[PDB]
Design a binder for this molecule. Structure first.
Ligand SMILES: [Cu+2]
Ligand SMILES: [Cu+2]
Ligand SMILES: [Cu+2]
Ligand SMILES: [Cu+2]
Length: 472
């Protein structure tokens, strides 16, 4: 059965809000979609790989006329693609070339916190640096890098800091997926921005309930085009927006196949003709353009807005056959004695709260034991009328969903997730086993809600290896 509906509650979508800004056509001729080159290692020594990542200011040609003053990693905007391999050890030098404190958060990476995790306790000062070391121990996945300085996160992402990060492993490699980067394999970082004389002005456009931008910005480009040379194409979608939801479908509702979620390959491929992504959610999809003619143009839309133009070249038709099962996901074993943690998202605008509280850097809100599976019950108490879908995210883990309001979970939610849209009046039940010690954040990933303080801290502890944390 092909999925032919968006898998969140229509009553709560972003376009119902009184302050909603619809997308409008960005000026300029259409450009090829920007595909960032992979970051080259500084040094490769067996299982040890060395990287340098620098947050820096630059100028990006986005709109006709004056370039836009932007922030990027190793460049003017966004960042390079960063490859991690499961089992390998990474030595990363994190450099801040900006005039303000920043932070380097690997969203979706299983890593120790709060320092290596790169949350608000891991500042990198202007013209200073921080070194981290970590071994990757999680399956192949589409994750990302972005700043996490409390409470400047929304503005720093707005200014352009985000990088697509790809974990690869032997199993994913064995599938022989489309993997020519920028030919038949594309990162699709979806963002939205407003410009004033071609310049960013976050303060001018700021909205407490989540800042929307007038123009669709895909991988830091406006009016993007993909030239389809090979008919089977991989699109790694990331909702990199401050608040906006993306309701993705081709203008003719051409079907596509989701093969992956936040934390990796799904157990089974899922066919669909549309998909909705809340903030920080990823969807790895395959599209077969074989049934189009070598002159046609196929437009990917969000709602009724033209987002990416696919121009069909001299393609040779090809069958797309995936294995069943697609990947094995080890079930987290749960019983009646599994501890249950209840966390409640409430309010909107300036009145957002997590369990009735605003974030405090020195306050640990919950304590859970390492390597012991936990049930979380995640609630959104917003009214179904006037309410809001809050994308709930946990650091330092991937989790599995049990149920949505005691009913079956969405057909693309049977794998690893680190971010879930919680509908108004919904309780989502999830199970998670934290494998890394440290302090980790959990919060709404609407970045203005996060910055207001819709965020809390969890200590993952070992009762036979205790740690004293010194939080400022
Ligand atoms: Cu994030
Ligand atoms: Cu995160
Ligand atoms: Cu929120
Ligand atoms: Cu976070």
């Amino acid at each position: 059965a092909m999925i032919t509906k968006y898998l969140y509650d229509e009553n709560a979508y972003d376009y119902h809000d009184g302050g909603y800004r619809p997308l409008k056509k960005a000026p300029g001729e259409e450009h090829p979609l920007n595909v960032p080159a992979f970051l080259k290692p500084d040094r490769i020594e067996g299982n040890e790989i060395y990287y340098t990542v620098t947050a820096q200011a630059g100028e990006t040609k986005i709109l006709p006329g004056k370039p836009t003053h932007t922030w990027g990693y190793n460049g003017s905007i966004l960042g390079p693609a960063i490859q991690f391999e499961t089992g390998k050890t990474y030595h990363v030098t994190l450099k801040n070339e900006l005039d303000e404190v920043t932070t380097f958060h690997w969203h979706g990476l299983n890593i120790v916190g709060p320092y290596e995790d790169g949350g608000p306790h891991a500042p990198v000062y202007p013209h200073g640096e921080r070194k981290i070391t970590f071994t990757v121990d999680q399956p192949a996945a589409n994750i990302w890098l972005h700043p996490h300085p409390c409470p400047e996160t929304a503005r720093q992402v707005w200014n352009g800091l985000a990088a697509p990060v790809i974990i690869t492993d032997g199993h994913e490699q064995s599938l022989k997926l489309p993997r020519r980067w920028g030919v038949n394999d594309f990162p699709v970082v979806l963002q939205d921005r407003s410009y004033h004389d071609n310049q960013l002005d976050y303060k001018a456009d700021y909205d407490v309930d989540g800042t929307l931008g007038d123009y669709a910005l895909v991988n830091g480009t406006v009016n993007p085009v993909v030239n389809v040379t090979k008919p089977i194409i991989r699109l790694r979608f990331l909702n990199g927006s401050n608040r906006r939801e993306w309701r993705l479908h081709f203008a003719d509702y051409h079907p596509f196949t989701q093969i992956g979620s936040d934390g990796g390959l799904l157990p089974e491929a899922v066919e669909m003709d549309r998909i909705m992504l809340t903030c920080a959610e990823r969807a790895d999809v395959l599209v077969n353009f074989s049934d189009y003619q070598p002159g046609q143009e196929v437009i990917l839309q969000t709602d009724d807005f033209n987002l990416i133009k696919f121009k069909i070249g001299d393609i040779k038709k090809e069958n797309m056959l995936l294995p069943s099962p697609l990947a094995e996901i080890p079930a987290l074993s749960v019983d009646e004695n599994t501890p249950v943690f209840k966390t409640v998202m409430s309010g909107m605008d300036d009145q957002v709260r997590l369990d009735g509280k605003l974030f405090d850097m020195q306050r640990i809100d919950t304590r859970q034991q390492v390597d012991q599976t936990q049930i979380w019950e995640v609630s959104n108490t917003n009214d179904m009328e006037g309410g809001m879908i809050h994308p709930f995210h946990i650091h330092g883990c991937q989790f599995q969903l049990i149920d949505r309001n005691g009913h079956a979970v969405n057909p693309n939610e049977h794998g690893w997730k680190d971010t879930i849209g919680v509908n108004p009046n919904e309780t989502v039940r999830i199970r998670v086993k934290f494998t890394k010690l440290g302090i980790f954040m959990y919060h709404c990933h609407i970045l203005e809600h996060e910055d207001t303080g819709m965020m809390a801290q969890i200590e993952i502890f070992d009762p036979d290896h205790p740690i004293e944390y010194h939080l400022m």
